[PDB]
């Protein structure tokens, strides 16, 4: 039989506004954001099957536009000014499962209170060999 299991992979982000009072000089960043990659609360945690996650950022982040998180939590925290598609590449411990690309549209806070707010979530099902 060709047996598989579906697992949920959530790519989301949060962010908070950074008032001008708390920005350093010549820092064009208005926000601090965090992109996260995780499973659902109602199925097993994703360290069991994910080996690493690559983040591919906008070229404005060069030469640090390519970030590798090899161990949980699969999070990326950055200051910034703009929204853009974050490309997430999830590699699996069992190399039988081929790596998958997820595109996440970064959403930045517009309440501008300086508190952290939930931005967006991109949810996909992945198939793992069983």
């Amino acid at each position: 039989s060709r047996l598989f299991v579906k697992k949920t992979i959530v790519v989301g982000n949060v962010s908070k506004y950074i008032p001008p009072d708390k920005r350093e000089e010549n820092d064009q960043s208005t926000h601090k954001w965090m992109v996260y990659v995780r499973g659902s609360r109602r199925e097993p945690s994703i360290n069991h099957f994910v080996k690493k996650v690559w983040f591919f950022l906008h070229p404005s982040y060069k030469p640090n536009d390519l970030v590798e998180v090899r161990e949980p939590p699969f999070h990326l925290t950055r200051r910034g000014w703009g929204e853009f598609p974050v490309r997430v590449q999830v590699h699996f411990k069992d190399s039988q499962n081929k790596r998958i690309d997820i595109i996440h549209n970064l959403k930045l806070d517009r309440t501008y209170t300086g508190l952290q707010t939930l931005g967006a979530e991109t949810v996909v099902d992945v198939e793992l060999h069983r």
Binding site: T30, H58, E83, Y112
Partner: peptide
């Protein structure tokens, strides 16, 4: 092209 834009 790689595009990026400020919400405000």
């Amino acid at each position: 092209a790689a595009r990026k834009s400020a919400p405000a």
